[PDB]
A paper describes a structure:
One major group, the Bacilladnaviridae family of single-stranded DNA viruses, infects diatoms in marine environments. The icosahedral capsid of bacilladnaviruses is formed by T = 3 asymmetrical units, in contrast to the smaller T = 1 capsids found in other Cressdnaviricota groups, presumably reflecting the need to package larger genomes. The bacilladnavirus CP contains the common viral jelly-roll fold that forms the bulk of the capsid and an additionalß-sheet projection domain. In contrast, the CPs are highly variable and thought to have been acquired from different RNA viruses through multiple independent horizontal gene transfer (HGT) events.
The structure of the ClorDNAV capsid was determined using single-particle cryo-EM with imposed icosahedral symmetry. The final reconstruction reached a resolution of 2.2 Å, with local resolutions ranging from 1.82 to 35 Å. The ClorDNAV capsid has T = 3 symmetry and consists of 180 CP protomers. The asymmetric unit contains three quasi-equivalent CP subunits, designated A, B, and C, following the nomenclature previously established for CtenDNAV-II. We were able to model residues 46/47 to 388 of the 390-residue CP. The three CP subunits are nearly identical and adopt a canonical jelly-roll fold composed of eight β-strands arranged into two antiparallel β-sheets (BIDG and CHEF). In addition to the canonical strands, the structure includes additional ß-strands in each sheet (I’BIDGG’I’’ and C’’C’CHEF). A third β-sheet, composed of seven antiparallel strands formed by loop extensions between strands C-D (2x), E-F (2x), and G-H (3x), creates a surface-exposed projection domain. In contrast, in ClorDNAV, all C-termini are oriented toward the capsid interior, similar to subunit C of CtenDNAV-II. As a result, ClorDNAV contains two interior-facing helices per subunit, whereas CtenDNAV-II contains only one, and only from subunit C. In ClorDNAV, no such density was observed, and positively charged arginine, lysine, or histidine residues within the interface region either face outward (e.g., R80 of ClorDNAV) or are positioned much further apart than in CtenDNAV-II.
Author numbering:
A (entry chain A), E (entry chain A): 46 to 388
B (entry chain C), C (entry chain B), D (entry chain B): 47 to 388
Write the structure that this text describes.
């Protein structure tokens, strides 16, 4: 049937079954989908202070809108965020429908970084307010030569604590300056949960060699029950959002109890999905004799949205027909807690 | 009888039962009311706001109490001159649903609200959880064969969910009664509706006004579970505003306050889509052409869970889940056509 | 496999499994705890508030940690004299659930809260998502056969959903311990309970106190997806309040603040209904006649999704969806009878 | 799977799918858009060109973006007085297709073109290959029943294929907007249309204007492979021309230049035929009798192959060949009747 | 049936069949289980005296409670235990239910290292006294690059001689200082049995290359007969326990004939299981031109316990139902003496 391609994309995020996947449950009567993808080379960094004497690169793949991947202790992170935000780098989906634009609220002039405490406005540029994740996957390949392919990795999926300050907003293209913004997992989660986490005790935890990580594939799991959409609400902020104050330009709620913090958390995250945390114990990188482990990151976030009539995409929307196999497809998918499976 | 419930679900004006429900077993004890109103509507002769324009703009939204807003209406021109797009509203007065505005400190009922003084929007329905079983609109042109020209175009759409797109106004369509309901805000036309490319929306249709009596407009639900809407307590000051004139149409001052989002959530069944209609009517200039006369028949079938303090709580019955509910919903919403035959 | 889960769903006190679930596959990885408590309750001898009254008022609510509130109990009269309707609370101390009040600036645990100074209600469970698999109360008249007179009446109702109808108090029923849960507020009796004509409510039943040992009260879930509740971070200054006395029962200071709605949403499983019970007991004069003594047995089967930091995360198991879940829920909630044969 | 595609093929206004295709597997990766427009058209009141004439001449052509040209319409009389036969154009503004006139040396967009200075007609779609899945026109007499008199006649014909029979004008029907499409040139009426004895043409039909609401005009494709059209880069100086007036209707200055043939080939899907319609309307004297007012509804379902630079490239889907394509096309084109029952 | 997951964990210690495995024989009427796991990077050390001129790392995986793995001649062992206790390192299960706490008996104040000869008390902190091993496995992966993956290994399982001084107590987390204690195989076993053992003569002995050890999986074998639980008895000691006197803080019975020695041996070891001894003939490590072989150790000990009513875990206990396939599952498992099998 026609739902076969949708189910295939549901269980295999990188599947080539269809360019316009859907969750065939009939929730979004008329909707369109985009397969957001990005491929980036990532290398563990040589940090002077924050990750001094550490060859561990920390990866969080989260169901956030636009910037699902956060990497701490990457060379790009050390370059772009020196000593700030855990020297992290972000992989997002620039030049694709989703995203926001920061404006000065009083005048409407786009502005990045935000000039807080002055009033700001995150303008939703996607032409949609309801969105959900069909499936989200990450593929990591060790791109070093055979004489430098040493190291290992550990990974586990987990139930996120839903703390507003665990998510942040950063440019979709991974820079610190472009005013096309997405929602990313905050590096603050690493130093409050991630670094101290007892990974081995999490169900589904797995480990392996970096030279074999190219055979692994990490994907988030949805619920077996109906996958409710996330509603993007209007968002304006003054001092209710904050950053480290440095050139990293990673902004997150100033606290966890304000109404803005909860609104930001709810609108920026698909809370039907789980999170995955990966530690890459890489080849050392000191810049003189060891130059770290270079990786190939391939992240795909399949998203279904309901476009509003003002959008030019509203003409392309198609009908979402409910299928009888959707629930059992999802249950079969999420009945295995293994953090990764073979490609 | 699940068959009668399904019949009402797919045909809002069906007479299968007087107590329809969504037979999914979500609300354990509940009671439903089929809110209805019949109103005559004519495109207005506005001096400035719609000067020279023969288009009457109709929005049918899944709001509690006042589903229909009509801009460039003769009633709108008379009641709300030069304000709120000279709109008129069709609601459900004298039926259980509704609110009453009070001055919060003293408790004195007060309409229009005395902003910035603290106000309270008291829920008078005796319920806090509500949902829409089905909503329908029927329009008939009431002109003679010598005056029955014109055409219409309509489409359903996914609403952008902006708090200022909804407003609160008297249920009976007046500006003073103080039996308030939630309506689509005429400000939606100024920002989305007027400049909207209707022809590009899926399910868009057009037709002649003389043939609109054979059409029927209904909102479409989701195929999945139809979650109910919760009415929260509502007190406000400067967080709500209006045009400041005698139109007495009030709405959130901005789109970002907590009150704005609470108002949006509680006033709208966000499981249902919206429909927009443009009526290209006979000109109404006041001297040589006197417009198109319409009969509007709007029905909103609502299911609520009454609280024990209500004088309707004793009449609640059980909601029994039926197997065919999802199939009925999917069959209903699989066709995006804005209207069908009656 | 899922038969034990269904058994616990329909029978809260069933011995089928120590780790029940709602087998719908909603929480992929989750663990469950069967929160239970057995207490002895007798009607009190109030000097002023319930002076001369022989009625104990019991509310069974789907609140996290302290589901039962008893007004005009001996323990209520002793611990909370002339305050909060001299009510007692039955909670689940020493088990996983609960909060801890802190001074926000320093993090030092502190009970009672030092209003209006900034307080933080730290969630001490390792979970943020929780839902009630099933909740039930058993009441046993422990009086001698010679003193078995009296009668009771009960009803289930759709809850007002007002923030001030819920409160926070120590889990162990005291006023001093800094392990806090969420309880139905005795203010609900003042506003709704006392003035309710219970006999009119659907599913209302009455019986003799000597036959209450054969009855079982249990809340009714929905037939649709039992969506979980999210515990949000909570910090309060003047947004919470109390009677000002030593009863230390704290609740939102109004029904409209952001904290009020957050508290109400996070503390209550809104997929369940509430139960109100009136116990008409033997009089308690304090010296010679000690009224009626009961055995209260309340069980709240809760499913939670533990976060990584929790030591319980290692024990979580996979929730597999079962085909009979909807049928079981609908069969359970299709009967509005407030109690069924034990 | 392909049933929806066949439905759109035989019924241009069908609601089967928002992304139709010709399922022949010609374009491996492609996306489709259903270009539609609904306009009100009434016969004009010309001072000189159509002075005293009640006939509107309508050409439905397979031109990219502006398929319909109406001569002697009120809008034509207003926008293009005494020029280009006082014609109106119905195009598809704001949708993907269209061009932009530039000054060739600087690249600055400029409309009208500054002949004889070098101009460039930049293709603003992200595609170079395009073909028409199906094209149809619906005409509705919007006059009152009292004023429903008049008749119409129509025929389909094999097109001359002369470059000056096509022109470029703004997509939105204006004379000033710099979003350009390809339209049938009103010069074709002067050379062919006006002097045509329509009654002799095969498939010719006539009817009453009051019954045109029951008719549907659609172009007929071939039964063989529907080969796509290629949009070539186009730069022109004196090779294009206009009447010299404010109507801004531009067409090749002769029929033999390389640019003339390139323009003709790239702007027209030559696998389709054309349709000529004569509407004999009520007279329009400009003050008391306003002639006949129609509702024009034209849909052009187009399949394109987007190039990598386009943002639409990500949305392209695989065109799978179907066994029923040839049968569907042959069944469609085997009937030369100019219109069929709506 | 439901016993399928239990049998799967019985035969595959790293199986993801269930998070709460059991031995479905109906011995422990009401019980709860924990899957104790730890993942540690291990490298053969460069010792100056004890393992001078030796590239052999000695691994013993024993059915001891909490610290099943002992590695001699590891870099961590050379660092933490210089010249003492065979320069060994231990992989245990910290932060998981099992373990002990050392106290001064007279005052009850926790104290590590013990201040012997003064009276000490090993306080059982698990909330249980009856325990048994469902299954125990070890996975070793060579984490060197392809230009440093030289070496080989040999392994054999054996029947332990049950000498009390062959086991010891050491912190669960592998340090020498944390007061959360477990039971480990004593390095003294190596110099009395292990170093001189004729490994090739033991049935089931196998050998291979270090670059292929990642395909091997070592697991202990239980008896085919009923798996009796081990009872943890109260334990207090003065001079009946001893160490080398150095900063290694590895403590073991002072002799083999005291009542305390036998009690320690019986309570700390599941004597229904066999032992495995592995020799890793690693790449040389001299600190100037060869830096040894780096490994990834992944050890899992699946344990079933009966919690006492004072424990908070007593509420979570489930019923142990006897299954008809348990005996044949165990017999099929232990009928092959091969020291390792493919993963």
């Amino acid at each position: 049937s026609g739902a076969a391609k949708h189910h295939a994309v549901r269980v295999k995020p990188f599947s080539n079954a269809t360019t316009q996947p859907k969750i065939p449950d009939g929730l979004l009567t008329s909707s369109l989908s985009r397969r957001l993808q990005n491929v980036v080379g990532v290398r563990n960094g040589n940090s002077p202070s924050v990750h001094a004497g550490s060859d561990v690169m920390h990866v969080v793949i989260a169901p956030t809108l636009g910037v699902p991947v956060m990497i701490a202790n990457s060379a790009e992170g050390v370059l772009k965020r020196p000593g700030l935000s855990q020297e992290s780098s972000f992989i997002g989906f620039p030049g694709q429908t989703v995203g926001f634009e920061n404006l000065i609220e009083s005048t409407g002039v786009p502005t990045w970084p935000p000039t807080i405490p002055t009033g700001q406005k995150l303008e939703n540029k996607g032409g949609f307010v309801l969105w959900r994740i069909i499936s989200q996957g990450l593929r990591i390949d060790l791109a070093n030569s055979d004489e430098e392919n040493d190291g290992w990795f550990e990974a586990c999926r987990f139930n996120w604590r839903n703390v507003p300050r665990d998510v942040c907003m950063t440019p979709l293209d991974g820079s610190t300056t472009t005013n096309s913004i997405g929602i990313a997992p905050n590096p603050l989660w690493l130093e409050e949960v991630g670094y101290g986490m007892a990974m081995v005790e999490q169900p589904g935890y797995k480990s392996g060699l970096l030279k074999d990580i190219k055979k692994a594939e990490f994907m988030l799991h949805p619920r077996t029950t109906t996958h409710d959409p996330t509603l993007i609400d209007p968002f304006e902020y003054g001092g209710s959002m904050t950053s480290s104050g440095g050139i990293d330009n990673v902004y997150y709620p100033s606290d966890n109890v304000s109404g803005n913090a909860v609104r930001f958390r709810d609108m920026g995250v698909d809370q039907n999905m789980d999170w995955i945390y990966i530690r890459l114990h890489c080849r050392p990188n000191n810049g003189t004799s060891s130059l770290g482990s270079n990786f190939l990151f391939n992240v795909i976030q399949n998203v279904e949205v309901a476009f509003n009539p003002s959008s030019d995409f509203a003409a392309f929307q198609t009908i979402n027909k409910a299928d009888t196999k959707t629930k059992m497809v999802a249950d079969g998918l999420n009945n295995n807690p293994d953090v990764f499976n073979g490609r």
